[PDB]
């Protein structure tokens, strides 16, 4: 499908370029007319005048085609990108669906209260551990000593 | 079909070039006439004058052919590019059609309400998850503490 | 030229007035911020320096 989009854009840019040439030729042809009629030739001056004119009207005609073809090119662009979005969206709806069948909310919620209970047990493990761990080395940290220390750095705390 | 377009443009540019030569020869031939009649020769001066003239009228004739042939060349150009646009357009109408038969709007719209329902379920999954997830670690974020904090940075907020 | 002199000079007046009040607004701003500063630093140094100690 892309192939046709690319050919349309190509045809558009094509028409623009050709129109551009015909216009350029038009200007050059004015110049050439002036050189011609400078001699006093009334025939060459004629067919040059003529080719100048046709170059200009061709410029109009081509450039018009460039317009309309460009428009269709735009809408085709929209059509393709729309296509991509549609496909990909179908993709997420499906994968998410078949992953919504085994992930259906009940199993999740269960997994979550299971979660609460779980790390709750983590916390009690922690607490227990730190009780025995702090009652084994506790000879090296009297309560009294810590009291007088904390007081020591209390009264003078911000005095430096 | 391109082959004939290319031969027409070729014939046009051909005629232009030959016309150009005949013109150049014309000027050179004026010069040569002057050299000739400088001696006083009334015969060489004749046939040179003659060839000068015919060179000029040939310039007219050729250049005229260049004009008209160029015109047909232009319209043929339009015909070809029109051809390309037509084919490619037929292409998009068809591919898009046979992709409009299995993509026919009803199935899409269905896919879309299915879409709403789907990500709706996503949101409830989210909400649930964050409830248990924020009620498990919630010991580490008292409500009171957050209140006094937010107030702390409320009163002085923009004072810096 | 003379009436323009009047007109411009009038604009100079009023714009100058607003300029003055804006000046007051800014300096007021500075004073407010800095004052908030002393109230706070002095406060958090009033918590560990509280009169009893």
UniProtKB/Swiss-Prot annotation, chains A, B:
GO terms for biological process: autophagosome maturation; autophagy; cell division; endosome transport via multivesicular body sorting pathway; ESCRT III complex disassembly; establishment of protein localization; late endosome to lysosome transport; late endosome to vacuole transport. GO terms for cellular component: amphisome membrane; autophagosome membrane; cytosol; endosome membrane; ESCRT III complex; extracellular exosome; kinetochore; kinetochore microtubule. Keywords: Cell cycle, Cell division, Coiled coil, Cytoplasm, Endosome, Membrane, Protein transport, Transport. Residues 23-45 form a coiled coil. Residues 129-153 are annotated as: Interaction with IST1. It comes from the Eukaryota. GO terms for molecular function: identical protein binding; MIT domain binding; protein domain specific binding. Its main location: cytoplasm. Widely expressed. Expressed in pancreas, kidney, skeletal muscle, liver, lung, placenta and brain. Probable peripherally associated component of the endosomal sorting required for transport complex III (ESCRT-III). ESCRT-III components are thought to multimerize to form a flat lattice on the perimeter membrane of the endosome. Several assembly forms of ESCRT-III may exist that interact and act sequentially. Interacts with CHMP1A. Interacts with VTA1; the interaction probably involves the open conformation of CHMP1B. Interacts with CHMP2A. Interacts with VPS4A; the interaction is direct. Interacts with VPS4B; the interaction is direct. Belongs to the SNF7 family. Probable peripherally associated component of the endosomal sorting required for transport complex III (ESCRT-III) which is involved in multivesicular bodies (MVBs) formation and sorting of endosomal cargo proteins into MVBs. MVBs contain intraluminal vesicles (ILVs) that are generated by invagination and scission from the limiting membrane of the endosome and mostly are delivered to lysosomes enabling degradation of membrane proteins, such as stimulated growth factor receptors, lysosomal enzymes and lipids. This is Charged multivesicular body protein 1b. The chain holds residues 4 to 163 of 199 of the full protein.
UniProtKB/Swiss-Prot annotation, chain C:
Probable peripherally associated component of the endosomal sorting required for transport complex III (ESCRT-III). ESCRT-III components are thought to multimerize to form a flat lattice on the perimeter membrane of the endosome. Several assembly forms of ESCRT-III may exist that interact and act sequentially. Interacts with CHMP1A. Interacts with VTA1; the interaction probably involves the open conformation of CHMP1B. Interacts with CHMP2A. Interacts with VPS4A; the interaction is direct. Interacts with VPS4B; the interaction is direct. Widely expressed. Expressed in pancreas, kidney, skeletal muscle, liver, lung, placenta and brain. It is found in: Cytoplasm, Cytosol; Endosome; Late endosome membrane. Signal peptide: none annotated. It comes from Homo sapiens (Human). This is Charged multivesicular body protein 1b. It comes from the Eukaryota. Belongs to the SNF7 family. The chain holds residues 58 to 110 of 199 of the full protein. Probable peripherally associated component of the endosomal sorting required for transport complex III (ESCRT-III) which is involved in multivesicular bodies (MVBs) formation and sorting of endosomal cargo proteins into MVBs. MVBs contain intraluminal vesicles (ILVs) that are generated by invagination and scission from the limiting membrane of the endosome and mostly are delivered to lysosomes enabling degradation of membrane proteins, such as stimulated growth factor receptors, lysosomal enzymes and lipids.
């Amino acid at each position: 499908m892309e192939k046709h989009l690319f050919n349309l854009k190509f045809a558009a840019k094509e028409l623009s370029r050709s129109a551009k040439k015909c216009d350029k030729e038009e200007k050059a042809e004015k110049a050439k007319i002036e050189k011609a009629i400078q001699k006093g030739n009334m025939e060459v001056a004629r067919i040059h005048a003529e080719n100048a004119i046709r170059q200009k009207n061709q410029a109009v005609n081509f450039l018009r085609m460039s317009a309309r073809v460009d428009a269709v090119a735009a809408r085709v662009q929209t059509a393709v990108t729309m296509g991509k979005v549609t496909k990909s969206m179908a993709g997420v709806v499906k994968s998410m669906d078949a992953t919504l069948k085994t992930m259906n909310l009940e199993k999740i919620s269960a997994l979550m209260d299971k979660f609460e209970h779980q790390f709750e047990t983590l916390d009690v493990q922690t607490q227990q551990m730190e009780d025995t761990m702090s009652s084994t080395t506790t000879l090296t940290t009297p309560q009294n000593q810590v009291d007088m220390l904390l007081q020591e750095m209390a009264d003078e705390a911000g005095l430096d």
